[PDB]
Symmetry: D2
Subunit: 486 residues, 4 copies
């Protein structure tokens, strides 16, 4: 895989870091260096924010009609689609993601999401109000201004567009800080945005480390809003940094411990295939991965046997190979962390059914893992592993499983497998999670808002809701004289 975009993207230009420093990105297949990327720090973020400030305050982008920003975003989406193979290859080498899924789903899904916001750009509405005095009131929806985005490594393309798509459609100027593990595709997008007609300073990309570049975005006095996706720990630092700088609003997606509930009436093969998909997609490196599987007692035993057969059949290997179902973990730290959690599961008394060990000659490959006899307060039942590890459990009643599903500090997503309308309605309304997937999984859609409850964070990505977070509501009021109606 070739890398042509390695510098920072500030003010419509690819530039080196002020320090002249570079950091390395590694391929999880081998641990070998892919490329050396310019290492942005506080000085580079300051330059990107100044570029974003100039583009918003005096530049053409927010002054454009919504229709003309949409036309530019539609051209940007078309360019993504023409570089689909190169973009998927970049994400496969940077993050260990399956190339076939990158081409078929991930990269076109990003272009599709950017089309959704491009189509929303000329349809943004405020309200005309109903005053309880002889006055005319209305609200204006205005771009927030300079927005700072801090993004993780698991879905580099997807996360980039969840943030960039709605913010740019709203008329904002952005500074994106991609994960140190995955800076590649974000620099390619900065190049495509420029080609599409996105003006200089509207999209700034500052690759670099978290406590340096990432913290500089969160603490910036001239950034109006920050949207952050990543760990619960860093989410606390981002929220604190906003409080101690300029009181900028913040939106956070902090991961979860997603339960999947399988009832007695489920089709066994469908439910096994669905749970396998929920747990092992992207080597378990997803904020919404099925992690706690609750299977009703009537089908429990047959489910365990089928889940074990299917997991052990999974082809683990080179993500570029189309016969491969599971690639390596992102890097060494993640790989080692998943191994520690697997050891924890064994140490606390859970039963290892399949996997639970690394595989292959080289690379960060871990066997799809199933633990049974998992108790609700166990570490593997409470902590986000972010790896190919399932906690398989049994339940008797609906009331009992609702309590189990909600026995977590998280609340991002949940899966329900049942044919009964009443069970589906009772369970979906009772689980404290932002997204409920009934007889499907990872049912993300550009039109559907996505965001957590509890420690999964707050604010939405996707849907019209995401567009609304990059718009301020301004109330304007004037008295009325001789009105024939009120």
């Amino acid at each position: 895989v070739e890398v042509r975009f390695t510098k920072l993207f500030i003010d419509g230009k690819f530039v080196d870091a002020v320090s002249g420093k570079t950091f390395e990105t590694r391929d999880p297949r081998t641990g070998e260096v892919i490329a050396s990327i310019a290492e942005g720090d506080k000085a580079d973020v300051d330059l990107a924010v100044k570029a974003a400030r100039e583009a918003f305050d005096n530049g053409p982008w927010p002054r454009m009609t919504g229709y003309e920003r949409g036309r530019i975003l539609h051209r940007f989406a078309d360019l993504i689609d023409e570089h689909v193979e190169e973009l998927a290859a970049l994400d496969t080498v940077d993050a260990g993601k399956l190339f076939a899924v990158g081409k078929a789903r991930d990269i076109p899904g990003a272009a599709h999401l950017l089309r959704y916001y491009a189509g929303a750009a000329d349809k943004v509405h405020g309200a005309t109000l109903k005053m309880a005095q002889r006055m005319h009131g209305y609200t204006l929806k205005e771009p927030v201004g300079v927005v700072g985005h801090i993004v993780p490594w698991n879905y580099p393309t997807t996360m980039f567009f969840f943030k960039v798509g709605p913010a740019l459609a709203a008329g904002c100027a952005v500074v994106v800080k991609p994960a140190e593990q995955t800076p590649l595709s974000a620099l390619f997008y900065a190049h495509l945005a420029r080609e599409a007609g996105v003006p200089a300073g509207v999209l700034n990309v500052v690759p670099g480390f978290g406590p340096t570049a990432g913290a500089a975005v969160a603490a910036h006095m001239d950034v109006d809003k920050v949207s952050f996706t990543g760990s619960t720990e860093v989410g606390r630092l981002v929220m604190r940094a906003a409080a101690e700088s300029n009181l900028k609003p913040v939106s956070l997606e902090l991961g979860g411990k997603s339960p999947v509930i399988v009832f007695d009436d489920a089709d066994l093969d469908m439910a096994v295939n669905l749970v396998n998909f929920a747990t092992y997609t992207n080597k378990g490196e997803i904020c919404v991965a099925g992690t706690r599987i609750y299977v009703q007692e009537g089908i429990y035993d047959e489910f365990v046997k089928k889940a074990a057969e299917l997991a052990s059949k999974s082809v683990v290997g080179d993500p570029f190979n189309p016969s491969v179902s599971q690639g390596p973990q992102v890097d060494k730290d993640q790989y080692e962390k998943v191994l520690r959690y697997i050891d924890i599961g064994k140490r606390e008394g859970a039963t290892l059914v399949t996997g639970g060990k690394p595989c292959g000659d080289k690379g960060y490959y871990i066997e799809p893992t199933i633990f049974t006899d998992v108790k609700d307060d166990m570490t593997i039942a409470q902590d986000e592993i972010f790896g190919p590890v399932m906690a398989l459990m049994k339940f008797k009643t609906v009331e009992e499983v609702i309590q189990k599903a909600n026995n977590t500090r998280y609340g991002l997503a949940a899966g329900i497998v049942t044919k009964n309308i009443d069970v589906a309605n009772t369970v979906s309304r009772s689980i404290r999670a932002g997204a409920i997937w009934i007889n499907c999984y990872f049912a993300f859609d550009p039109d559907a808002p996505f965001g957590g409850y509890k420690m999964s964070g707050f604010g939405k990505d996707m849907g019209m809701d995401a567009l609304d977070k990059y718009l301020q509501t301004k109330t304007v009021v004037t008295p009325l004289y001789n009105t024939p109606w009120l």
Copy 2:
């Protein structure tokens, strides 16, 4: 039962008709005269429209804030609740409706629907637009003006408020023409509206005949909008009258031939009790009555036996008696029409399972009727009977029953009885009817819009949609100069 309100209500006053004429209202229990009511004609409608015109053009009502119209409507709703016994008694003697249901459901349901619109009155919003030019655009929601309402006899109170509630909340002045069979409660409401603080000319009630008073409302040159509920035939006359007068928009609720579909997986006792409820409530005198019952072959035989037991045991008699489940038909014409359809049913080859004959010494009482071996092309399977008559049929497949459900001129409502989520979703999306009731029936709610497809008419009653039909949308646009965002 005593009648104290017998005159027309025009310009905040109870007045006699210009002609001095009166018509009689009869008790369906005996055919006896209840009271003599002032008979409004074209001259009285002209006086009511002039009163409504003055109240809208120069009066305080549309000039009030939404909050202050809401406070008056809240007072109006409270007054309804304090006169529940008297109001229910009036609708029983006038329409042959059950007194216990009047007190428990019908009359408080009207006060409740009035509170829903009172609460919407101060929350009406238009939009601020997203112009594709350097312009500021917005929409204003203004009261339509003078509204004419033509209502039927089946739910006198309910129909009155479906129309009056949203129109008064919006700031309109109304002219109500109640059915000749049921003018009583509408005059009591005109008295309560005045007591609540509804200004003179805002709510006018002109009891009288259809081709005289009703036609005068539909054809009026100074009525801005008309809402009609009743027969398909008259609906054609109302729509035509609007076209040949001032091109006022209309909304029409024209009744239906509602199917109820019972699948193999339903709880038989629940399904039987639900269908019995759907077919026989208010002696079948409902636009949404369950008329065509489709029962899947696996449970068909047991369903027929159980449906016949419930229909045959049903207590037919005095609607004032709390042990009575079914009162008399509204009047002689309706009673005779139901009897003609029962006779056509027999002559066309259907099987009479139960009823199919009048009962009692006096009054317009008809036995709950079940016909089996009903073919889709039969008159009783195609025409609205508006009586206690069920057409009970069998089906094998989902695809077959979707076609059967849609094999009608109408599209008002449909019932589905199944526990399976997928069947419920497939069937509900496939039936061309405005309201789909899954595992329930008559699930009307102030927040839920109600209106037909096909020959059942167009426009909505109930929900925020009903409020929207009494508001005009006015687009206002001005250029913008030196805007820092667009």
Copy 3:
């Protein structure tokens, strides 16, 4: 100008009329025959409705996701943009419209409007309701089905897309009946729709006469909705035809008698230039043309003199010539009708200031006309002329001008020229017209709903409102069990 599309477009094919008959389209520049077009009658409309019925009931179009219908409409909009010169030329020869305006505004404005609906296609929302019982209620937005569009000759492209854009985005199948005077561009669009991927039977175009083909669409038993733009007289026949056939809902845009109000604080040159634009654009052949000009007494005299100078400077001639400001009237009937109205103005005592006579050797050219000393009840002050004729009047007070502006049976649009915020708010809220243009004119926008009050008709074209008229609202309700919240 070359004509390559002359046949009917039924079921994705260009076909001759069942009768084999053809009618001629003439060029208003000469009165010479442009082309012979297949003459559709009741038999051809029946074939188009059957094609539309098959495409909706069993075809892929409504089964597509909103996103995929949008992608097809975006391709359709791109194709319009690449045939901009040919399309403008067709509209110039068929309707006598300025070629420079066709290329710069009319044709790209249509492609732009189709992009607006393409972008709305994947964002259509219903509601989840707030039930006052232990129930879950929601609304579904479903395509209405087979839609019939009857369109006038004044803006052939614009009118076509106002109707087709939202109906196709919603998932409907259409039968368009273009005006006999302007069938050309509509057949070119049918060809472009097919090229874009619009499936067979989704867009049917039946050129032909009004009482034959047009009446056949309005009276069709299998058309679910009709949208009509044209004369008040025909609007009555369309509404009546719906009432006497299947009770299909109807939306009507019936023309107007638009007032423009100029206050004492207006910039004289700006207001004169604005009024000149409002009155004479498209030779006065617009439903929203400035027809009644009210100028405040303080500036009245200077306004008349300036309006006369400017009108007499107007270059009347060949619409293909870029130096020409005003083309010929559509045809002989329109030309003669405008001349009769000019004679009426003189006959009833109005003062002819400029024009009021035909000009040139050949073609249907009429001089821009100004009448002063126009009284409010005069025929030229009350009737839609649809020609280059201004009724210039004086007023003293705001209260007086509000009454004058509303002294009409129409209510489509109005213009206000003032710098004062309070006058603008009082006047805009008091004029009973669907569109208020403050210090601008013809401020149409894809995001702004457009539709009349009073005899201008009802229903909206443009904005999200237009999309809503091709969608039915279906209420679906189910009970809830053990819900932790309601």
Copy 4:
């Protein structure tokens, strides 16, 4: 004035603090002790949160229909209205607020705002989505859960209801921590809520100090959301406390430095009376007080003379006296802080036009103060004083004044005084503040959202927006089978 409610209100009961401790509330008119109030600390907040948790998790309140919560809130609003004199008297003695304004505006305005949310309770809607797959998606609006409210002393009643009204309407259980300076009316409301039928644990009121009780609410592990109104400094502490506890979302109203811009074309007497009203209402103790007055050069000199006349004649004294226009500052700290800013104003070179000194024998009375020759970089032009102090300045151009208006850390509200439509539109769109009041001031309305930009905070109080912050959006998705439309 008598005080009957002095204890904490936890779990539907008036209880003493766990410690048995009490704190004193003083009358700003004398510095005299009014009453001794139970002093809530971390232990009492823990008991209130447990009561709120029980009421939400297992209690009837969120299980009620929206309509039934609305009926209780309507009863609650009626009770407020019957105790208006007593309620106003309590806020006068506690906050030094005018008694006449309490009775006429403040207390009935709270009952009115409570009616607005009661009316919204049965109308809360989510959406049915437009999926880009063969799936059915929808959103549910569910109560957030347990909500903590931290309120200031300036508008005790108003602030209480801005928070409590929408949160209770949404189905939440609340813990309110009123300001130590103003705990009185909040305990009276807790008593009225109970009387109205608000269930035990739904509304808890914990009077007490900020770093103790207030910090305990902000840092609570079982509080789902927090709303804070007060100083910027504490706002940082609240946001940080959320980040370091459970990552609960916050909303913050942090005050401002509101500019009022008077253009050359304003009616001088109207503009002067409006600015006087904006600056001195509630002795300048308002987050939206007019603080920086910018007057255009053409009228500057006459404005200063007229503003000084009105400020100097203003009746300062007993807030119980109806002839009094300005009461004392809340307490000693506020009084001393205003005096320090007056001294900084003089020391930094500003010109004292009037006031600038304390008045009277006893009480915290400060003379209405005007400073001229105020430069944009001065402390009195940059810091929120929260006192009767005006910074009166001159400007030449629109562009200049837009920059001056935005030369602040804050962005809460701004006033514009002009008759010109274009200046009003340009200026209103250009000022970075949440509320723009044109030719009026303090134009708050239950239907109008209110919230700041920049360092004034984020989130809205009032309008439907306030209701939305107490509702979670849950996305629910299921596949579809054999759908005839998508």
